[PDB]
A paper describes a structure:
CDT is a member of the Iota family of protein toxins which also consists of two homologous toxins produced by Clostridium perfringens (the Iota toxin) and Clostridium spiroforme (C. spiroforme Transferase, CST). All three Iota toxin family members are assembled from two polypeptide chains termed the “A” subunit (CDTa, Ia, and CSTa) and “B”, subunit (CDTb, Ib, and CSTb). All three B subunits are presumed to contain five domains that are involved in regulation (D1), oligomerization (D2 and D3), and host recognition (D3’ and D4). Once proteolyzed, the mature form of CDTb forms a large heptameric, soluble structure referred to as the prepore which binds one molecule of CDTa to generate the toxic moiety, CDT.
During classification, we noted a population of the CDTb dimeric assembly intermediate bound to CDTa. The interface formed between CDTa and the CDTb dimer is facilitated by interactions with both chains of CDTb (buried surface areas of ~241 Å2 and ~122 Å2 were observed for Chains A and B, respectively). Moreover, our data indicate that assembly intermediates can form interactions with CDTa, suggesting the enzymatic component spontaneously associates with the intermediates that form during assembly.
Residue numbers in the entry:
A (entry chain B): 218 to 313, 320 to 678, 682 to 746
B (entry chain Z): 67 to 463
C (entry chain A): 218 to 315, 319 to 451, 457 to 748
The structure:
């Protein structure tokens, strides 16, 4: 029970699992989960298991400044904020006075799914996809709203040799697990390589503190304008003719956040809160190099966590490893019930949602999976330097408790027990679903994925912006299939999804996931 | 902390040269000067006059007497259970839990008693938390009264509060608080003051003479004649008769009338205050001899056996008790290794004996026979190479 | 006895009984409740039960700044300042210094309009859900403007602005503070939002307001002069929103950022407000507390009440029912089964209830398990947003009756009511409510409760206004909350007629008529 690092936790409780109850550390006797307690493990060469300012007893016991999320309660997942900026409107004016103004919508994870390449059938134990480019939440991509495709140059009489101005509306949000005080975004604007003008904001004019979850401006409120800014008061961003005629094509404008600074909260003996001597400036550059990154994108909200893991090649560090399933169980509020992880009600699983990987970590995890005999990627060792994106289906049925398809699927029978996850379907005849434009976002990209087994040829038929029908012969075990398509505008016809089997096949865990947006 | 530091440099600009030199002398030698201030009064007058620490001790005591507080202050400090006659460890440093049964033992040990606090002691003004030193599981949180000594002083990067505790304490309550997951005992006690003189013997003589100059006129001639007998040699015969179980084994009605006259004379003028006196007791007063191996306190086991036998007990003297206001060592009983410290409640019988002219008694006071003392504490020190004991006891009626 | 935190009150006295009298702490024994003394409940794990910069001792012992409301002396309600903007008069002039062409209208600012602007009622309410769901929940930050002195006339008629220029805008504004907290160093910011376009943002600075904004009071002290927007310059406008404003839409007032400090009693004398700020404790407060808004027909209050998390053993935080949370949040007299303000009775059947999507869904989830089927006995979870609307007119065939007209066929000689008495319906019931008590061009909902102890004994109701209707109400053995919409119009119209034809057996109770929002007039 000797203490090596000064944190007042016995070392036997840190090698084993321990929980904090009665504001003290007791060993995990594997009978406190039904109470509602959870288990932590702390490293002993350093009193801070993760590199956050808060210490292992304070972090693992809930002694922090209360404003952070509840998912940073473990001493393994740190709490630092990841701000983000988006645009919700565009104004183009020539006065230093014609004006054209439209609406824009932002997606946090759109460039991360921009370069991912899909394959029909995954011919390994990988059963996933690898993207070429990994983008965080802090950068984001925008789409202008409906305008019937009319040219932007017919509303402004601007020729070669003249410059228009940017006016817009912006919103600040957080997706991490921390509020950051004295908000100084210092964001930037890029337009396919060349930047137009960086955006510099001050502490008091925008919101001083910016808590996670909620936004500045709040949900369902007017976004903050660029005219009401001391820098952009007598001048705005100028544009030449070539740039606007390039934006006449199917192109988009993107935002990033470059560098921020500010203080953090702490406690006091005489007072209670002071945020002057604190800073995040010298703590981010430790967290960014020790841990591994997870990003999730539900269709309404994105989350990210940063979970620590050991390097394989060095005996000298005693930071305990994790597997991928336990890492997403601890990082997220993932309840593991019947062996399956659920965030709130959306299932999260290798067999239920889409997982997207970068290029470097894919090689290492494919090397590790050959050692693994389970051939499932939730049990491989999480190491330092992992970057994983996970995307939720808009619609995903598993012929089970989770069903969200907006139209009923024709010829579906779930009277079987040999499905991969609970019951499955039988393609005795053929399954079909009509899904119109009003239930879908316009001018997008999608992939349709699922698990099949055949203990025969199966034809898929997708009515889309381009009709696509295809064949696939299934295996006796489960092989994941996926098919890419794109849709067209709202006033068009529908999406008809048709699957004709051979009578003796089983299909389970069928999903539709958003990938990209088609240009115009 | 901020307030403490603020009147630390507010005090520091009014200090003198010898006072500040004694202040850094204590800054470098805190523990030894504190233990010296605990037990210096049981030495000789010339031992104190030739002691090296006495000039710094009196300069610091002058500084503490100069700095008085305007309001009662709740203060905090850490100290061993052995200080409060709990001669054992409540919880160790590797232990974090003070159980309910050992808290009950501490309750049933420290209750309903007055415990001495003497010498210089550091304390803290606000409740210690995580960033402070917590050496012991025992934190006392005391209401210091008005005008008590108060020295906030900045030592290097820290600040500390030094006082001259010169009072007993009554422990009103103890509660079981938790700091950094470790159980601590937080003691809410009361400062209870008694009149003590120690080495200040001339002023105590003046007080006893002022309180007892007309006492001889108020006694009967039988009482006055028996008092004159007692101060002229009758103390030997009277005390010998009383220890020998006089009225039972060998009844002497003349000596019964004599001791009744002395008892009524002591009942004539009860004392107007709570007092603290000292007595150079022999081993024969404690069931021991000079040849007793237990009398040699130079080994620790004799000290511990004496503490086990005598602390927390009621001791009865069936004879009249002759003590004095002085705590100093004398040539008459420097041989004796027992120094008894007695706290007398107000209104108890007794008189100051050295107000009568023609008596060779040195600042002596007398107590009625059959008296009982509740022994509260036993401490130890080194008079020369001889280990001597300090027995803090209180007169119970 | 045993102490945990940096307070004198022991953890045994910190839960299940909590009383402070004459600067000492005592438990509760249900005897001295009439001595001006109340049992509180606080935490024993920390000094500050809420995010306030005050301990549970001082606010429940009076050792704090006296400008705070006495409802905030309870430790379970967070002291929280809210600074809002009311607007009263619009003037439009074409000059850039202040002659020119001027038009002038007098407006009313409504706080609780856009929260319930997209609220529609059902004829029958399912399960025990006697409430509605809003499209969006709004706090009292936004104000919606209703022009009352608006004759049939385009704003272009008074301006005759042709192609490219326009006039300038000026307005009369007021600054209210409604909360359990004051604020001293006034520096607010407020946007003039026009349906997605930011017209301008006004900052009042410090000298135009003064160094005090106490709760419940405005900077114009009740009746004082409206503050025009010239003291800091004029605001322009363009000729593109003029017809847009003329047709259907209104200008919204949105407070954005309000800076200020608070006062703390020092050791010696009066408060100090230099080492303080209402900019650090705010996010600490908002993270734990729920939101209870109440809107009387003349005023509003809103309260931050600390609630709990069910999905953890570790936390020890007080739990409340909804009705008791309202009771301690605003201060309510406990009548026998009833809650009272100074005059308004409040219940789950005497006021109107608004939740957003998440709160309504989780309350419907909780309604499956409660054995009493009421809103007010639902466990209080951190992060609820609940709006209460005190009805404009409400009667119960009992002691309260505030209706201007008198009905027909009123039989109150019965006691099988929802609350005490009921009404025996025999035939028609006629109320001919004069229009002068009804605001122009407003949406009003009539709600009632029906109990018919017969198999198919039904009634008709019939609301006669400019947008009239005849509805067929089928009551059952229990009561239904039945609600019908209608719209008031401009003042040159007649009374509102409400007829209902009963069948001699049906019973009604708790009849109320309330306002939702304003309908857009054609201009
Ligand atoms: Ca450790
Ligand atoms: Ca450790
Ligand atoms: Ca399934
Ligand atoms: Ca306490
Ligand atoms: Ca508490
Ligand atoms: Ca009634």
């Amino acid at each position: 029970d000797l203490d090596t690092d000064n944190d007042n936790i016995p070392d036997s409780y840190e090698r084993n699992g321990y929980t904090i109850k009665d504001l003290i550390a007791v060993k995990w006797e594997d009978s406190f989960a039904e109470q509602g307690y959870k288990k932590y493990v702390s490293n002993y060469l350093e009193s801070n298991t993760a590199g956050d300012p808060y210490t292992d007893y304070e972090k693992a016991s809930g002694s922090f400044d209360k404003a952070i999320k509840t998912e940073a309660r473990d001493p393994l997942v740190a709490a630092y904020p990841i701000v983000g900026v988006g645009m919700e409107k565009l104004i183009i004016s020539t006065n230093e006075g014609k004006t054209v103004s439209r609406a824009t919508t932002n997606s946090k994870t759109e460039s991360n799914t921009a370069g991912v390449s899909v394959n029909v059938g995954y011919q390994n134990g990988f059963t996933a996809n690898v993207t070429t480019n990994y983008s965080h939440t802090t950068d984001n991509s925008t789409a202008v709203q409906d305008s019937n495709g009319e040219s932007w140059n017919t509303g402004l009489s601007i020729n070669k040799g003249e410059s228009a101005y940017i006016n817009a509306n912006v919103r600040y949000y957080n997706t991490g697990t921390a509020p950051m005080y004295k908000v100084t975004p210092t964001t930037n604007l890029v337009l396919d390589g060349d930047t137009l003008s960086t955006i510099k904001a001050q502490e008091n004019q925008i919101g001083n503190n910016l808590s996670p979850g909620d936004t500045y401006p709040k949900k369902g409120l007017s976004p903050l304008a660029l005219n009401t800014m001391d820098q952009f008061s007598s001048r705005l961003i100028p544009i030449n003719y070539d740039q606007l005629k390039k934006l006449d094509a199917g192109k988009q404008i993107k935002l990033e956040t470059t560098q921020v600074s500010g203080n953090f909260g702490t406690k006091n003996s005489s007072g209670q809160i002071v945020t002057e001597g604190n800073s995040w400036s010298d703590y981010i550059s430790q967290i960014d190099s020790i841990s591994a990154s997870i990003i999730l994108d539900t269709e309404n909200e994105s989350y990210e966590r940063r979970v620590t893991a050991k390097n394989l090649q060095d005996p000298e560090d005693k930071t305990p490893e994790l597997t991928i399933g336990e890492a997403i169980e601890k990082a997220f509020g993932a309840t593991k019930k019947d062996g399956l992880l659920y965030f709130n009600d959306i299932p999260i699983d290798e067999s239920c949602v889409e997982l997207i990987f970068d290029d470097n970590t894919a090689n290492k995890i494919k090397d590790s999976l050959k050692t693994l005999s389970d051939k499932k990627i939730y049990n491989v060792k999480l190491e330092r330097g992992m970057n994983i994106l996970i995307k939720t289906p808009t619609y995903f049925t598993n012929f089970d408790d989770y069903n969200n398809y907006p139209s009923t699927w024709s010829n579906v029978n779930t009277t079987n027990q040999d499905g991969l996850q609970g019951s499955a379907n039988k393609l005795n005849g053929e399954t079909k679903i009509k899904i119109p434009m009003s239930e879908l976002k316009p001018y997008k990209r999608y992939v349709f994925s699922g698990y099949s087994k055949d203990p025969n040829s199966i034809i898929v038929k997708i009515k889309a912006k381009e009709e696509k029908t295809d064949y696939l012969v299934p295996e006796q075990g489960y092989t994941k299939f996926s098919y890419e398509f794109e849709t067209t505008e709202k006033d068009s016809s529908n999406i008809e999804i048709t699957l004709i089997g051979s009578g003796t096949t089983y299909l389970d865990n069928l999903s539709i996931t958003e990938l990209n947006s088609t240009p115009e | 902390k901020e307030w403490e530091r603020k009147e630390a440099e507010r005090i520091e600009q009014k200090l003198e040269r010898s006072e500040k030199e004694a202040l850094e002398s204590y800054k470098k030698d805190s523990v030894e000067i504190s233990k010296y201030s605990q037990t210096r009064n049981y030495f000789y007058d010339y031992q104190i006059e030739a002691n090296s620490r006495e000039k710094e001790y009196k300069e610091l005591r002058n500084a503490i007497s100069k700095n008085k507080i305007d309001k009662p202050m709740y203060v905090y400090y850490f100290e061993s259970p052995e200080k409060f006659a709990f001669n054992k460890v409540i919880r160790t440093e590797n232990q974090n839990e003070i159980s309910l049964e050992k808290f009950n033992e501490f309750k049933e040990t420290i209750q309903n008693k007055l415990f001495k606090q003497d010498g210089f002691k550091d304390i803290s003004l606000y409740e210690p938390g995580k960033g402070d030193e917590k050496p012991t599981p025992l934190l006392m949180h005391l209401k210091l009264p008005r005008n008590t000594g108060m020295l906030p002083y900045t030592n290097t990067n820290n600040v500390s509060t030094l006082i001259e505790q010169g009072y007993s304490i009554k422990i009103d309550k103890i509660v079981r608080i938790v700091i950094d997951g470790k159980h601590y005992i937080k003691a809410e006690a009361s400062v209870v003051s008694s009149l003590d003189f120690k080495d200040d013997v001339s002023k105590g003589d003046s007080w006893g003479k002022a309180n007892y100059n007309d006492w001889s006129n108020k006694l009967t001639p039988n009482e006055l004649a028996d008092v004159n007998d007692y101060m002229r040699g009758g103390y030997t015969a009277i005390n010998n008769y009383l220890i020998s179980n006089g009225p039972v084994n060998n009844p002497n009605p003349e000596l019964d009338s004599k001791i009744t006259n002395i008892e009524n004379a002591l009942k004539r003028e009860p004392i107007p205050t709570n007092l603290t006196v000292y007595r150079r007791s022999g081993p024969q007063e404690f069931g021991l001899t000079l040849t007793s191996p237990e009398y040699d306190f130079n080994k620790l086991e004799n000290i511990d056996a004496f503490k086990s036998k005598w602390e927390g007990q009621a001791l009865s003297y069936p004879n009249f008790i002759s003590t004095s206001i002085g705590s100093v060592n004398m040539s008459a009983f420097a041989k004796r290794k027992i120094v008894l410290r007695i706290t007398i409640p107000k209104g108890s019988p007794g008189a100051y004996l050295s107000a009568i002219p023609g008596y060779a008694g040195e600042y002596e006071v007398l107590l009625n026979h059959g008296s009982k003392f509740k022994i509260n504490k036993i401490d130890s020190y080194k008079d020369g190479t001889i280990t001597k004991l300090i027995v803090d006891a209180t007169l119970i009626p």
